RNA sequence: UAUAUAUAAUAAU
């Protein structure tokens, strides 16, 4: 469970979806995983997104390069958890 | 130095740093800690980081049982990154009728370790549907009693299931 | 079916 790995799109409006990601962090390198999805039950959580890149090695160049950048209401967070 | 600042848990949705200092300082001294419950923006996760300076407050305080807010507190010395996220957490489904968190925390208490285990209540929030939780520090006692998924409980079974990773 | 955390994370069943 390293420090960076995966990118967590939470304040985002439904402006930029699974298409605009796709390419706003993959700005830098290939990815891996892209999921989107909203706050049905829990009723807070707007344009929520995870982002999975190819390691720390894509992950090290998009995360240290793009992580947290003016976007939304609240930047782009490094994330980390990974899924076997 | 290697001890000192602990990591408030279980704070209640509702608690400022002056009042928790206010209400720990009845320990010992304090020097500084950064709580993030914040009921003037709204709400965020409810813990507390307690710089005590003398090391002693730490071992009464986590060795002592308290509450704030009258809801329910876990404090505890600051716990290794590592450690905390090898620690594992189930939920459990279905409950005696009438149980309280004594039992039920000291149910589990035998095999795997019990690091942060407890029934849930109306009290807490209004939810006593029903239900259980249990935190080892590890995840091998969770496969462990997971092939036991109903166990013997009081008078009612109790259906294990994991805290929500399906796994 | 439901959970108050290491200052951050959607869905499901």
Known sequence: ?84 | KESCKMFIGGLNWDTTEDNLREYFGKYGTVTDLKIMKDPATGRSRGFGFLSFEKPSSVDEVVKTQHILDGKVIDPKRAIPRDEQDKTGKIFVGGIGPDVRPKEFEEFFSQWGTIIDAQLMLDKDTGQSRGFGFVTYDSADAVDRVCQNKFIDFKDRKIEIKRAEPRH
């Open chain 1, 1 to 84: 469970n390293p420090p960076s790995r995966v990118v967590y799109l939470g304040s985002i409006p439904y402006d930029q979806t699974e298409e605009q990601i796709l390419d706003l962090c993959s700005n830098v390198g290939p990815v891996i995983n892209l999921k989107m999805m909203f706050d049905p039950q829990t009723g807070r959580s707007k344009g929520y997104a995870f982002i999975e890149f190819r390691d720390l090695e894509s992950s090290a160049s998009a995360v240290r390069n793009l992580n947290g950048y003016q976007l939304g209401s609240r930047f782009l967070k490094c994330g980390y958890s990974s899924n076997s």
